[PDB]
Amino acid sequence: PMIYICGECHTENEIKSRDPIRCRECGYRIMYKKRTKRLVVFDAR
């Protein structure tokens, strides 16, 4: 369930191995990975 948001459509595309990297509902060629809930620790200094 690796999601990628389109560049201007903003549709969640899930891509894999061996498949092209175009976007559904459009045809753009740039897609940003999505932020999942993972724990990271930062210091307030």
Partner 1 sequence: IAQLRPGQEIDLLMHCVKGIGKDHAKFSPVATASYRLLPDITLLEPVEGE
Partner 2 sequence: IVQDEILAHRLGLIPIHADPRLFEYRNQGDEEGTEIDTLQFRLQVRCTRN
Partner 3 sequence: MIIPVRCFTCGKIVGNKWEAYLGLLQAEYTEGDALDALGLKRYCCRRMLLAHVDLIEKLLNYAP
Residues of the shown chain interacting with partner 1 in the complex, contacts defined by CB under 8 A: 37, 44-45
Q: Output the smallest distance, CB 4 to Zn ion, in A.
A: 10
Q: Does residue 43 bind partner 2 (CB under 8 A)? A: yes
Q: Does residue 14 bind partner 3 (CB under 8 A)? A: no
The vertex-40 CA angle with 35 and 45, nearest 5°, equals 125
CA distances (Å), 8 to each of 2, 15, 21, 42, in order?
19, 17, 15, 32
Question: Is 6 annotated as a binding-site member?
Answer: yes
Which positions make up the binding site?
6, 9, 23, 26
